[PDB]
Design a protein around this ligand. Structure first.
Ligand SMILES: NC(=O)c1ccc[n+]([C@@H]2O[C@H](COP(=O)([O-])OP(=O)(O)OC[C@H]3O[C@@H](n4cnc5c(N)ncnc54)[C@H](O)[C@@H]3O)[C@@H](O)[C@H]2O)c1
Ligand SMILES: NC(=O)c1ccc[n+]([C@@H]2O[C@H](COP(=O)([O-])OP(=O)(O)OC[C@H]3O[C@@H](n4cnc5c(N)ncnc54)[C@H](O)[C@@H]3O)[C@@H](O)[C@H]2O)c1
Ligand SMILES: NC(=O)c1ccc[n+]([C@@H]2O[C@H](COP(=O)([O-])OP(=O)(O)OC[C@H]3O[C@@H](n4cnc5c(N)ncnc54)[C@H](O)[C@@H]3O)[C@@H](O)[C@H]2O)c1
Ligand SMILES: NC(=O)c1ccc[n+]([C@@H]2O[C@H](COP(=O)([O-])OP(=O)(O)OC[C@H]3O[C@@H](n4cnc5c(N)ncnc54)[C@H](O)[C@@H]3O)[C@@H](O)[C@H]2O)c1
Ligand SMILES: Oc1cc(Cl)ccc1Oc1ccc(Cl)cc1Cl
Ligand SMILES: Oc1cc(Cl)ccc1Oc1ccc(Cl)cc1Cl
Ligand SMILES: Oc1cc(Cl)ccc1Oc1ccc(Cl)cc1Cl
Ligand SMILES: Oc1cc(Cl)ccc1Oc1ccc(Cl)cc1Cl
Lengths: 287, 287, 287, 287
């Protein structure tokens, strides 16, 4: 009965955010996209010109249903946080209500309360450097955008969410085991995020009866995966060769798990890291 | 084609087996019950007598569709393995073809290939003794009926299963953290079950493209729970007071997760221990 | 043969840093203290006036041996990071060579290379708030001082350390399980630190043949423990009542583990979180 | 008083038992060997013949001081438990008092109370079969000789131990992550051992103030390793290539950790699985 989900983190149809949007669409959930300003206009132009029409197809006689597309920057908690330089940057100057709090309000004003929230974003200026070579600023940058954004998303979205709502984010196993190449303190950020998921599950469960979990996804060749210098090709080849299930991992494989976790079906699951990675995580060595 | 699930471990309607059966029925999965011989004839009597009618109600829609109900003993792998005493037993004498292999063959003969397997059983003759006071015979019994039974189930059932099939079992957090009353080597059995789940995931995944996972449930006042040392009333009271989600854990809460994990929706998840306990496992201590 | 250890984080003799210093002293390791400027002068004055003389006693006819006491701020990586305001702050104006890099150099110039390094510090402006109420600045503050400080300590100290050197830090179980009261993103910081310990173990082991581990200590009534608002009294009472070993946890209990980990005895252990907490961590519920 | 350690699981000098014996000897611990009857007389022959002389050398200082060497079978708890076949066996007929209880009594009769206990043994009749092809008899054998043996050891040995005593066993990471050749239910046995370590820690800690821990060792080319499926040459080659610390793992590396955990130095550590594998366990995949 009128399910509304806000997917924070979508710049195209090659990431998990898209896969999550498709699977939720299949379940008749109304989709609102939160889009980072640097790519917002290139996203809208593409969409308008029907460049994603093929990607919105679900099976046959069923195509995706996007309720809304909003500019969104998870760096900024409230309008008062936006530094003057960003406020007048070429790509930010034409946009408004793009902070975490302002999007929360905008959504509420326009559609009332929502019941599903997705954290599908991450960033680190120095992802290309290893932990040892990461500067304090670069490290704090990764934690701020990749980790804290989650806590902020919750602080502000819980006011516009109904009890028994569900919140998921996306993580990676480099938090628990060493993955060379996953630098800039991204591993640090994922560890924090998985730990924050537990602490948040406590507060949100007790105070609001809201669930929060995180999906630790396997490798997908998304735009950001390529920014890591290649790393992602190796990860994919390795996973397809050594995982219990040797099959290509699709963004919709994650989508359908996200979808389950966001629905009332998973009402007794909260605070968990759920692995959606073809079982790779359970392996010790290659064979 | 429809789906067929064999559920091994149903003795009444107050356990997880029944709850898993209910949820799969919502999805129109044809259900087959594996019933432990000692309680087979009383179960049949209660069923005939319409004592479960109410518990088989799904909603205005339809009622639980039970394909078949057969006697099943996880203590014996093949007909050869049954001893004199059991063969000579009041309850078993009147029944036949209840060993793991016999049941595989019988299901297959009658209904063909299945695609969903549920291990929802456990036993430990010395459950009421703490680990230090448990005998070798007692300890190996717990592992035999609660642990190996899973490996046996797989070995024999895989020949009668389709590719892309799915298997689940039930575990408890006592495997990972000390739970004082959970004796007799049940903690040990659960630890081995959770690890066996991984190894099996590797084997079944690579060789047959079949998934296996385990659900770590919170407390439910079932026939078996009632036997421990009351242990279960305490566990339930503690969970409902300190879990992130303060709400009654129902057998159907686990059922709906079991249903997801047994469907194609979770095609990318294998070898995992999913926690369905209202988030109790994430807590360090009472708050 | 001339063992030199730099303990970063010591404001008095009530914290772990002191306990680690005593146990290392007992092994004839030369001790250098790194002291945060806000408490440096009050520390020296106390020491000079023999206020710690009782605390330096080890058994009989054996008293602690402190090679040096240096002002140290783990907020600043190099002299170029120190903001002008701090540089002229009442407590910082009379001190110099107190950044991570400058202490590394100072130590090297004065004593040559060292072989043991201890990270025994932590801080968070908003420790009193829960994760949900923690601001972005407060969260980043905790990660910067509590987590990154470790990575920085390593980046700069590896140049002044011999191969087969050992590095330990101190962590807390709130990283893995929820501990209400452990706020400000300290839990976040500890999770990062435990994950960073693994990544660092990889780089330091391969490139320098240096080990790094972390001790997850139980509750101790240190100065900082009291800053958490009481929380620590509850933690201590709980631990003394429910831990496998019901005995008072002493700073020297941690000291002797640190000491082992820093010695060549632990040459095959790296990247690990070692629990020194009277076994509390292994418990699920109170009894 | 001096310390006495019983080491159960010595068959030659190429295993972990011997390495643990060497390191404890450095500390002047009096060593008692528990030797599996099938290899008792060849061990005695080799010893008399001075085949171990070289391996008993500690340094210019002193040589390994072995208090006693007795026949020990972890397959039998008491004299009553030995069957006809074993009683009738070539190797056993000439020996006596080799059951777990008999050995406890005999040590106690001869030397009094001990204070250090080492479980360094394992067995699995079907180790060369993968888990899916392992029989019930095979699986329960692995658990019986490799798992329960620990619980038995404790039950019987605690009466002959001082308060504040310490116990260790050896495990392998195959319990937590899939290691393809580690069959026969050895992975299962190790999983149960690691969990049993926690439960035992609770019981022994509260009731007797006794600690128990387990060491998860990396690969060592021992008699038993040589039997697996060569599995062990691969494990060793992989470990030496990908572990954080690229150096040969020696039995004495584990020995020195065992020695620490068995001393008062580790009074605050219990119920733990300590990893001594050069940090191999922290790696996700080869780099
Ligand atoms: N792709 C993988 O292999 C993989 C594996 C594990 C986890 N993940 C996780 O999945 C999530 C999505 O990553 P992806 O792989 O889909 O890449 P992606 O190309 O989808 O990028 C994520 C999106 O987040 C947006 N974003 C970046 N900074 C933002 C900010 N400050 N505010 C708002 N939005 C911002 C980007 O525009 C981008 O569109 C990430 O959290 C990532 O850590 C990905
Ligand atoms: N009830 C809980 O609180 C709880 C919490 C976590 C996990 N679990 C797990 O869920 C599973 C189901 O148990 P439950 O809690 O529903 O209680 P239950 O008694 O309803 O289920 C146990 C069933 O196993 C059957 N069984 C016993 N020995 C058998 C044998 N040798 N061969 C075949 N069947 C045998 C019994 O007939 C019984 O019906 C168990 O594996 C249990 O470990 C239960
Ligand atoms: N005390 C406990 O109960 C407990 C439990 C688990 C872990 N720990 C960990 O042990 C470590 C030591 O804490 P403690 O309990 O001994 O408290 P403590 O009173 O010893 O405080 C730690 C020291 O670090 C110093 N410090 C703070 N900020 C610094 C900076 N920017 N640069 C340099 N030094 C700085 C402080 O002056 C203080 O003396 C911490 O990392 C803590 O997280 C403590
Ligand atoms: N070797 C490795 O690579 C490795 C890695 C991790 C852990 N471990 C563990 O270390 C321990 C010691 O084994 P190892 O590697 O030194 O090889 P090992 O052969 O030297 O030690 C095993 C010993 O156990 C004894 N034993 C076998 N069955 C017995 C029974 N029923 N009763 C009493 N004793 C019995 C054997 O006589 C043998 O001497 C084992 O528990 C093993 O699981 C070994
Ligand atoms: O978490 C990820 C894991 C993988 Cl294998 C690939 C991509 C991932 O996602 C990111 C990684 C680094 C940065 Cl800076 C940003 C993002 Cl979105
Ligand atoms: O695992 C369980 C956990 C809980 Cl809290 C309650 C019941 C459980 O299930 C069992 C426990 C012991 C035995 Cl002998 C048999 C079963 Cl079916
Ligand atoms: O980690 C700790 C755990 C406990 Cl139980 C007590 C004190 C601890 O140490 C700290 C906690 C918070 C801050 Cl802001 C600084 C420090 Cl040194
Ligand atoms: O646990 C082990 C792990 C490794 Cl890598 C090598 C040897 C090991 O030890 C054993 C393995 C199997 C059996 Cl049947 C008996 C033992 Cl003593």
């Amino acid at each position: 009965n009128e399910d509304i989900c806000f997917i924070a983190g979508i710049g195209d149809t090659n990431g998990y955010g898209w896969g999550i949007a498709k699977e939720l669409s299949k379940r008749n959930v109304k989709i609102i996209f939160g889009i980072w300003p640097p790519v917002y206009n290139i996203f809208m132009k593409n969409y308008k010109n029907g460049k994603f029409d093929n990607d919105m197809i679900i099976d046959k006689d069923k195509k995706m249903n996007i309720l809304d597309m909003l500019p969104f920057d998870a760096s900024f908690d409230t309008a008062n946080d936006i530094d003057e330089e960003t406020k007048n940057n070429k790509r930010y100057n034409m946009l408004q209500n793009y902070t975490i709090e302002d999007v929360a309000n905008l959504i509420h004003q326009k559609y009332g309360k929502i019941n599903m929230l997705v954290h599908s974003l991450a960033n680190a200026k120095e992802v290309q450097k290893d932990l040892l070579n990461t500067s304090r600023k670069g490290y704090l940058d990764a934690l701020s955008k990749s980790s804290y954004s989650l806590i902020s998303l919750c602080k502000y979205f819980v006011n516009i969410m109904k009890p028994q709502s569900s919140i998921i984010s996306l993580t990676y196993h480099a938090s628990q085991k060493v993955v060379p190449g996953y630098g800039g303190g991204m591993s640090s950020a994922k560890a924090a995020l998985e730990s924050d998921t537990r602490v948040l599950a406590y507060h949100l469960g007790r105070n609001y009866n809201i669930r929060i979990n995180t999906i630790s996804a396997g490798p997908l060749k998304s735009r950001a995966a390529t920014a890591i210098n290649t790393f992602i090709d190796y990860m994919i080849e390795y996973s397809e060769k050594y995982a219990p299930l040797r099959q290509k991992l699709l963004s919709t494989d994650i989508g359908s798990v996200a979808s389950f976790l966001l629905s009332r079906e998973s009402r007794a699951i909260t605070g968990q890291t759920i692995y959606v990675d073809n079982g790779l995580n359970i392996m010790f060595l290659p064979d």
